[PDB]
Amino acid sequence: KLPASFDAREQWPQCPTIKEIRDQGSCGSCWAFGAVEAISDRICIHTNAHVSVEVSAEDLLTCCGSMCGDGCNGGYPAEAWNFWTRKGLVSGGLYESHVGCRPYSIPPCEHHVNGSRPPCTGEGDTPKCSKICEPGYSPTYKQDKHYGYNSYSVSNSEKDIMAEIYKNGPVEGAFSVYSDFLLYKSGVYQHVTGEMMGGHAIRILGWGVENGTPYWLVANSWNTDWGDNGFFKILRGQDHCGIESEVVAGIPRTD
Ligand SMILES: *[C@@H](C(=O)OCC)[C@H](O)C(=O)N[C@@H](CC(C)C)C(=O)NCCC(C)C
């Protein structure tokens, strides 16, 4: 039944958010970015591309509060999707994009790569929960909220995660970052060297096989000059670094 490879970007070509890589900046907001990225994709999938919006990382990061964790000091993906069912999330694009209700307020930076942006630094301050859209945005903040029908865990099962993506779209997951991951450029990542850096949440949008090695297709939130245009592949089928152990998702409510 399931194909040997699957790429959500190919399945849903009228859903540009599936292709988009974001930048969490110097803020420990991975938990929020994996969530709003996958939610953006799923709203588009759920509406057959009639609604394509960048869901606001700012709104989730700043307005969830203690139930999701501590903002830029880290958080809990399962409760991020729960917040989407309870209070909903407004739209908002990239830093200084002036797109949507609440664009991200934390500037982009260089994540373990060289570039023209400032180097990323340690976990900044969490911005305030501001329940107002940027000036001139036409829907009110309340009216711009997109809600989830539900939020749920996917079991620690390769085939279960594969089926979830195949039917319902990209998911959020999390894994343990070891130092050798930081220099990833291409290929299928397998941890071989380096100490544990901490847990990191990401968006899983497909799977495949490269040179006989099964992999998950993953979007990072470290801008496009990190990794493979902002994406990476990681070993699939052995819960490698915990990649299959903390998968979460949810189905949108119809706006
Ligand atoms: C993730 C991040 O931004 O790292 C990039 C530098 C945040 O630090 C974050 O929210 N991390 C974390 C929750 C904290 C540690 C309470 C998380 O989501 N960990 C995933 C668990 C993993 C070991 C399977």
Numbering used by the authors: 0 to 254
Reported in the publication:
As a result, two inhibitors, K777 and E64d were identified with an IC50 value of 5.43 and 88.85 nM for CTSL, and 174.30 and 244.26 nM for CTSB. Significantly, E64d has been used as a clinical drug to treat Alzheimer’s disease. To explore the inhibition mechanism of K777 and E64d, we determined the crystal structures of these compounds bound to human CTSL and CTSB. All of these structures were solved at a high resolution with unambiguous electron density in the binding pocket of enzymes, allowing us to clearly define the interactions. Both CTSL and CTSB belong to the papain superfamily and have a typical cysteine protease fold. The isobutyl and methylbutyl moieties of E64d contribute to the substantial hydrophobic interactions in the S2 and S3 subsites of CTSL, respectively. Notably, these two hydrophobic binding groups insert into the S2 and S3 subsites of the CTSB substrate binding pocket in a different manner. Instead of occupying in the S2 subsite of CTSL, the isobutyl moiety inserts into the S3 subsite of CTSB, leaving methylbutyl moiety in the S2 subsite, resulting in a twisted gesture of E64d. This might be explained by the narrower S2 subsite to accommodate the smaller isobutyl group since Asp160, Met161, Asp162, and Ala214 form a continuous steric hindrance barrier in the CTSL to prevent S2 subsite extension. Aside from this major difference, E64d has an almost identical mode of binding at S1 subsite in both CTSL and CTSB.
Host proteases, TMPRSS2 and CTSL/CTSB cleave the SARS-CoV-2 spike to play a crucial role in the two alternative pathways of viral entry and are characterized as promising pharmacological targets. The entry of SARS-CoV-2 depends on two distinctive pathways, cell surface entry and endosomal entry, where the transmembrane serine protease, TMPRSS2, and endosomal cysteine proteases cathepsin L/B (CTSL/CTSB) cleave the viral spike protein. The crystal structures of TMPRSS2 and CTSL/CTSB in complex with the potent inhibitors were determined to reveal their specific mode of interaction.
